[PDB]
C-alpha cells in the first residue's frame, strides 16, 4: 500500500500504469478463485500451505517496511505476514462456495421485502445500457450531492428524468445515492409519473429492508468500548468503514468520532488529515489545488462563514444506507461491470458555461414544442460546442428557465477529485495484543463517480475528455473502462483482464476489507436479483 504524492490523480494513475506494466512478472496467487474444492485441496496448489487459520490471510510481504511507504517499493528479503479476515465471505470460494452463499441468502430473505419484477427489469435495463447519456453524469458531477444544488434544479431535473423515462422506459439518476434520496423526498408528490416514483420507492424500501435484516440478526445491548452491537457484528453498520464515493465530509467526521480507540489515519493526497473548507465560488475556485482541502458544501439551515466549524449534513442512518446501497444494490445489478472514476472539472465547467437560451419578447408565451425558432433546442440555436448540442444528442427536451437554473447552481462548485486512503486498527472484539499491529487500508474517491456501462464506439464525445478511470474496489474493477484512460495499449488491456487494477495509493487486496472472493461472488453468480442481495448481506458479517 503506497502513499499519496499530492498530484492531480491523473498523473498518479498514469505513473501506476507505467509501474504496473512491468511490476508483475507472473500471475498472482490471490486471483485464482476459479479452482474448485478438489483443485484447491490437491497438493500441487502453492496456496495450500498458506491457508491455516479460518480468520487469517497469510501472504508474502516485503520485510522491514512499515506498510504505508513510497511509490517505488524498497528492495528487501521477503517475509510472511498475516492480515485478519474480517468479512466471513472473504474465505476463498473453493472453501466457501457460491451455491452455499446463495442458499444462505435464500434462507435469509424468507419473509422480508422483495422487489417487484417491473422495477427489477427497468433497473437491469438502465444498468446494462451503453447508450446512457453523459448529461446525467455531468449533472451528477456538478450538483455533487448538495441539497440546495439539487432543489435549485427541480424543473430541469423533472424534465430530464421524464424525458428519459417516457422515451425508453428506463430509469435515470440511479447511479448516485444522493439522488434517489432527493427524488423520493422532493420529486415524489406527483411531479414524476406514477411508475417512476414507484421504482425509486421500491429501491429505497429494499435498502431499508436490508438494514432491518441487519438489525434483526444482531442482539442489542452489548456495546464494547464505544462500539454498538450493529457495528460490532456487521460492517455496513460500522462507521469506520466508509463509502467508496464520498460527496460530503460527514462520513469522515463520523468515522473519526465513532472509532476513537482503534488508531486512525487519513491521508488526503499527500499530507495527513482533511480540512473541509466550504463555500467555494468563482472568485476563489482554484482548480489546481495541491493542498488537502476538501469541499464540504453549504449547510443551508445555518451560516457558512469562516470561523464557524463544520457539521454533518445528515443523520448517521444516511451513511449506513449509503454503504448498504453502494455495497449491495450496485454490485448486484451491475455485476462487476461498473467502474469508479473521478472528474476533470477544469474541462467540465467551461463546457457548462455555454447556454443559448434566446431572448423571448415581453407579453409572449413560453414555447413548449421544439419546432418553433423561439425554442432553445430548435435547429436554429444548435450552435456547436454549447449545452444545446449536449442536450440534443440525448434527445431530451428542456425549456429556457430550466437551462437558466445552471447559473443558480453555479454558486457552489467542486474543485477536483482526490483519493482518500483511510486506515484503522481492528475493532475491540478482535483487538488482541498482536492484531493491533495489523491494519486495514481501504481507499475512497472524494467527488468521484460511477458509470454503469462503458461505451467505446460513441465518437460524439472524445474519450477521456471528462472522466478518467481510478477504480478502487475488487467489486468496482473495470477491464473495459481503462480505454478511457489516456495512453492505453493492448498489452495493458490483456494484463488487466486477469488481474483487477487497484493502485497502491488506494489500498491493496490483502490489506483491505472488501477482497477478491466477494467480487468473484458478485460476478460469477446467476441466481436472482433479490436472493443475490440477501446473499451479499449474509456475506457482510464479521
Amino acid at each position: 500500500v503506497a502513499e499519496g504524492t499530492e498530484d492531480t490523480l491523473d498523473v498518479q494513475m498514469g505513473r501506476f500504469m507505467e509501474t504496473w506494466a512491468d511490476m508483475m512478472p507472473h500471475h498472482p496467487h490471490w486471483v485464482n478463485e476459479h479452482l474448485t474444492i478438489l483443485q484447491f485441496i490437491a497438493p500441487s496448489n502453492p496456496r495450500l500451505r498458506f491457508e491455516l487459520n479460518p480468520a487469517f490471510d497469510f501472504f508474502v510481504a516485503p520485510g522491514d517496511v512499515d506498510l504505508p511507504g513510497p511509490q517505488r517499493p524498497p528492495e528487501a528479503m521477503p517475509t510472511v505476514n498475516a492480515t485478519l479476515r474480517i468479512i466471513n465471505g472473504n474465505i476463498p470460494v473453493p472453501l466457501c462456495p457460491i451455491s452455499f452463499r446463495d442458499c444462505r441468502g435464500t434462507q435469509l430473505g424468507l419473509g422480508r421485502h422483495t422487489m417487484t419484477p417491473a422495477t427489477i427489469k427497468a433497473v437491469k435495463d438502465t444498468f446494462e445500457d451503453r447508450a446512457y447519456p453523459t448529461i446525467f453524469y455531468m449533472l451528477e458531477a456538478v450538483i455533487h450531492g448538495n441539497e440546495r444544488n439539487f432543489c435549485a434544479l427541480l424543473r430541469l431535473l423533472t424534465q430530464c428524468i421524464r424525458g428519459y423515462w417516457e422515451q425508453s422506459h428506463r430509469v435515470a439518476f440511479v447511479n448516485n445515492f444522493h439522488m434517489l434520496m432527493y427524488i423520493t423526498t422532493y420529486l415524489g408528490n406527483g411531479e414524476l409519473p406514477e411508475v417512476c416514483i414507484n421504482i425509486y420507492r421500491d429501491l429505497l424500501q429494499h435498502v431499508r429492508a436490508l438494514r432491518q435484516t441487519i438489525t434483526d440478526f444482531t442482539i442489542q445491548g452489548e456495546g464494547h468500548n464505544g462500539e454498538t452491537s450493529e457495528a460490532l457484528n456487521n460492517i455496513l453498520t460500522d462507521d469506520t468503514f466508509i463509502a467508496p464515493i464520498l460527496w460530503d465530509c460527514d462520513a469522515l467526521i463520523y468515522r473519526d468520532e465513532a472509532a476513537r480507540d482503534r488508531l486512525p489515519a487519513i491521508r488526503v493526497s499527500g499530507r495527513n488529515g482533511y480540512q473541509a473548507l466550504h463555500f467555494v465560488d468563482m472568485a476563489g475556485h482554484n482548480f489546481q489545488r495541491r493542498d488537502n482541502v476538501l469541499i464540504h458544501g453549504r449547510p443551508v439551515r445555518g451560516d457558512t462563514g469562516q470561523a464557524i466549524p463544520i457539521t454533518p449534513h445528515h443523520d448517521r442512518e444516511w451513511g449506513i444506507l449509503s454503504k448498504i446501497y453502494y455495497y449491495i444494490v450496485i454490485p448486484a445489478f451491475s455485476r462487476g461491470s461498473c467502474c469508479t472514476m473521478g472528474v476533470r472539472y477544469d474541462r467540465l465547467y467551461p463546457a457548462l458555461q455555454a447556454v443559448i437560451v434566446p431572448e423571448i419578447p415581453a407579453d409572449e408565451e413560453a414555447p413548449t414544442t421544439p419546432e418553433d425558432p423561439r425554442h432553445p433546442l430548435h435547429a436554429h440555436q444548435l450552435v456547436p460546442n454549447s449545452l444545446n448540442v449536449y442536450f440534443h444528442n440525448a434527445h431530451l427536451t428542456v425549456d429556457g428557465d430550466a437551462l437558466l437554473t445552471l447559473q443558480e447552481l453555479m454558486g457552489d462548485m467542486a474543485e477536483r477529485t482526490t483519493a482518500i486512503l483511510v486506515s484503522s486498527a481492528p475493532d475491540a472484539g478482535a483487538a488482541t495484543a498482536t492484531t493491533r499491529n495489523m491494519r486495514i487500508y481501504d481507499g475512497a474517491l472524494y467527488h468521484g463517480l460511477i458509470m454503469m456501462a462503458y461505451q467505446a464506439y460513441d465518437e460524439t464525445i472524445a474519450t477521456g475528455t471528462f472522466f478518467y478511470p481510478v477504480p478502487v474496489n475488487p467489486l468496482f474493477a473495470c477491464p473495459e473502462h481503462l480505454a478511457s484512460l489516456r495512453g492505453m495499449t493492448n498489452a495493458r488491456r490483456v494484463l488487466a483482464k486477469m488481474v483487477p487494477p487497484i493502485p497502491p495509493f488506494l489500498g491493496a487486496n490483502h490489506h483491505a476489507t472488501i477482497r477478491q472472493p466477494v467480487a468473484y461472488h458478485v460476478t460469477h453468480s446467476k441466481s436472482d436479483f433479490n436472493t443475490l442481495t440477501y446473499s451479499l448481506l449474509g456475506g457482510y458479517f464479521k
Binding site: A351, A379, L382, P384, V389, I461, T465
Partner: protein
Amino acid sequence: SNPTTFSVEAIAAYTPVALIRLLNASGPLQPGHRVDIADARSIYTVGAAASAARARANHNANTIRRTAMFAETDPMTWLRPTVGLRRTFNPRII
C-alpha cells in the same frame, strides 16, 4: 453548353454537364451509334454527380450549414471541449 456539343449519347459525353431531373436517357434515348468509346459511363457518372451537387446550388439558404458531426481537435481545444452534432434534426429554417 454552347458550342460545347450537347449530349446526344454518341460522342458528346462531357463532365461539365448542367441538367437536373433529365428525362433524356430514360426514353428519348434512341439506341447507341457505331461509335466505340467505353469510358463514357465513367464520364457520365462524374458528370451526373457534378450536375447534382451544382443542382443543389440553392436549398442552402434554407438548410443550415454543416457542422463538426464528430469530435475532433478544434484549433483552440484548451478552453472548451469539442462536441459534434448528430444530424438527426430537421434543417429548414423557414
